[PDB]
Structure formats: C-alpha cells, structure tokens
Amino acid sequence: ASKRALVILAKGAEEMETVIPVDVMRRAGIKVTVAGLAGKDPVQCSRDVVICPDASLEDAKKEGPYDVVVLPGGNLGAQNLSESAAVKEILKEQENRKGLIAAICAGPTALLAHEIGFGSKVTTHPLAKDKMMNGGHYTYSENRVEKDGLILTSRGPGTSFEFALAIVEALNGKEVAAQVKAPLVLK
Amino acid sequence: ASKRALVILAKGAEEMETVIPVDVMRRAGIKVTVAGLAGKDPVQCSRDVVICPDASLEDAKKEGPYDVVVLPGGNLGAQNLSESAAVKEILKEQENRKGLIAAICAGPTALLAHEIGFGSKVTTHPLAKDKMMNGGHYTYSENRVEKDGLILTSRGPGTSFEFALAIVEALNGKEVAAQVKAPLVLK
Ligand SMILES: [Cl-]
Ligand SMILES: [Cl-]
Ligand SMILES: [Cl-]
Ligand SMILES: [Cl-]
C-alpha cells in the first residue's frame, strides 16, 4: 500500500511551503490529502494564492491514520494551526502511534502550542526561533532540515525541497528520494 | 507606480513553478495577476494542486500592459499555452513593446510555438531541450537562469526561486532582489 500524507492547510499558510511538499510527495507516489482546517472552501494563503483543498480537515481526519502529518508555515497559518483543537488531537494521535510529524518555517510553533515532541532537536525560520524556544522545551538547530526521530522540521521557503525530500526519504527510502530529486534541477 | 506581472495559468501547469514566482514577486511589491487561460474557474495543476486564478486571461489581457509576462512550466500547461491564440497575441505585444517575458521548465517551448525571441540564448528543463531546439531558432544554455535581453528562462522547479529573483532584479533592481532573498533561507 502506498504511504499517505495529511497536509493541513489554514488561512495564511505560506503557499510555497504548502505546494512544494504536496507536489514532491505526489512525485514520490505518496497519497496526499490537502485538508482545509476551516472546511472544504478555498484557502487564501499568505501571499494571496488561493488553493482549493481536497477535503475538509473534519472529513480527512476520519480517513486516518496517515504516515505523515505536515504543517506548512506562514505565521498566520501556523497561528491558526496552533489554535485548533482538531489539530491538537491529530498531532497527539500521530505522536502516540509513532508516526512522522513534519513542520516548516513557523509551522513548528504549532508543535509547541500542542505540546508535541518536547525534547526534540528542531529548527524553524530564524524569525520564529524565539517563539519556538519559549520555555526551553526543544533544542535548537540551524540545520536546513532537522530530524529527531519522528519530528522533522525545516527553516523556510528555500528549504522546502530539502524538507519534502526528507519526508520522502523517511517514508519511501533514500533511493525513491534520489529518483524524485534528479528531475527537479536542485542546486 | 508598482511594476505589474501577468502569470498565465493553464491546466497542467507545474504548481511549484506557478506559486514560487507569484509569491516571490508579491514579496517584491510587484502587482501580480494570476490569469486563468481557460477562464476564472479553478485550475487543476500537474500534481493535482488546484489554484483559483485572480481573473480570466480574457479579462486580465484588457488590463495590460504588464512589465513581465510569466509562463510557468508543466508539459501539459506549456502545451496549452502553445495552442492559445490569446497567449500568442499577448507575447507578440509584449515583445513589440520591449517588455520582459519569463518562462520556466517546459514553459519556454510556448515561446517557440508563438515565434517569440528567436535568436535568444535560452535554457529549459533538460527534458524539454529537444522540443525547444527544433529548427535551431535559439541558442541553448545549461545555466540555471538565462537572460538574453528581454527573454528570461530557467530550468525546473528547483530553479524557481532563482528565476523569480531574476524577475525581481530585472523589474525592481538588485537591492530589492537581495532584500527579498534573505528571508527565504535559500542555499
Ligand atoms: Cl508569513
Ligand atoms: Cl531529468
Ligand atoms: Cl510536467
Ligand atoms: Cl530573516
């Protein structure tokens, strides 16, 4: 069976950090559900790109479990994720079942909000470090992608490909990640 | 007055090559219109991301002229662009007024189809080289971004940030491009 990914899409998400992982994961043969936090209506992202989700989160969360739960960044998107009881339940269940959780840019701050993965080495966007580190519940890294067991984090739009390929490597292995990578013309 | 960009969005466009330039150009303060080739309805991109355009191309083309016309890639998107009389008219008018034309991945093959910028040095995705070079009307480059006067081309999803920043540099200058670049956490 193919691996499955849930990408939780909130108003104010960073559209690059949403689309790059969705696209790359689909290139890797992962079945990706783009789930709208607020419902099935189109989502206005941080830079005004409007993305139509595959499903509401309400519906998608009934079709679990997923091999990865992905949290895009965008400050306002991440705040929305941080405020959601549905997201809290999903991430706690994912942590409890030892499933991967992946978050980029400000996205990792939603892990703090929901008390997920404390003790992990993490990265974030430089501008999100102080938020993430409030209370000292994580150990900070400046690596472009950081993975500490089942918590996978990354820094910003420019690390999105590396983040997505790390997800692919974790789920489908190094060879699939290398095969997906080559046609992308990465630096 | 701010500079203005028209991004022409066709079914089968590469969503990363669509969203990265839109987002980066908006970060640079460019007024970007995402124009749907087929009309104002949501567009299903190559990897099934669905993007809602700002306007139809029919409508957006009445609000010209634009400082840049941007053609995303995606093989099926580029074919759609190549088959469109509306796109032909837009690109011919843009070339005639010495305005920038920017195309990525397979996107440059639409320049061939519409007989735009012959004699220019161009790049494309490696898999689109032979299509682009049919007839020897361009000189090929393996540079990640190529700019020959008002024809700006680039290779693939992984060169999208460099492509977008080259657009920004051309329109708003080197300092604005460097300022936009820094928060992206590029390699
Ligand atoms: Cl943001
Ligand atoms: Cl290739
Ligand atoms: Cl394609
Ligand atoms: Cl910064």
Swiss-Prot record, chains A, B:
GO MF entries: cadherin binding; copper ion binding; cupric ion binding; cuprous ion binding; cytokine binding; DNA-binding transcription factor binding; enzyme activator activity; enzyme binding
Modified residues (Cysteine sulfinic acid (-SO2H)): C105
Keyword tags: Acetylation, Autophagy, Cell membrane, Chaperone, Copper, Cytoplasm, Disease variant, DNA damage, DNA repair, Endoplasmic reticulum, Fertilization, Hydrolase, Inflammatory response, Isopeptide bond, Lipoprotein, Membrane, Mitochondrion, Neurodegeneration, Nucleus, Oxidation, Palmitate, Parkinson disease, Parkinsonism, Phosphoprotein, Protease, RNA-binding, Stress response, Tumor suppressor, Ubl conjugation, Zymogen
Inducing stimuli: By hydrogen peroxide and UV irradiation. In pancreatic islets, expression increases under hyperglycemic conditions. Expression is also induced by sulforaphane, an isothiocyanate obtained from cruciferous vegetables.
Top-rank taxon, per record: Eukaryota
Described purpose of this protein according to its UniProt entry: Multifunctional protein with controversial molecular function which plays an important role in cell protection against oxidative stress and cell death acting as oxidative stress sensor and redox-sensitive chaperone and protease. It is involved in neuroprotective mechanisms like the stabilization of NFE2L2 and PINK1 proteins, male fertility as a positive regulator of androgen signaling pathway as well as cell growth and transformation through, for instance, the modulation of NF-kappa-B signaling pathway.
Protein name: Parkinson disease protein 7
Lineage: Eukaryota, Metazoa, Chordata, Craniata, Vertebrata
Gene from which this protein is expressed: PARK7
